[PDB]
Amino acid sequence: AAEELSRCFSPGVIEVQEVQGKKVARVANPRLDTFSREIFRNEKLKKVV
């Protein structure tokens, strides 16, 4: 779900690191974001961000 999150934003904004075997999404650079509000179409991650 970290990758689906990283695709609902301008691509540089959510940098998906690999802290453990699992993948964590982190907000690397908020400034690159264009307001496209494409998370709000996800219906499961509009509650997370």
Add this chain to the structure above:
Amino acid sequence: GGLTCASAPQGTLRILEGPQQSLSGSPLQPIPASPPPQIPPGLRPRFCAFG
């Protein structure tokens, strides 16, 4: 020695020339249906924010 009326004909034949029907195949169109408009592959964003 003249011409006289003879016996009435017993039947009539009417001839016409006719060809026949082929199988129904119903080949509607070369490239058929209304083919849908669609996505160019990959595309990519052609615009970025400032900063």
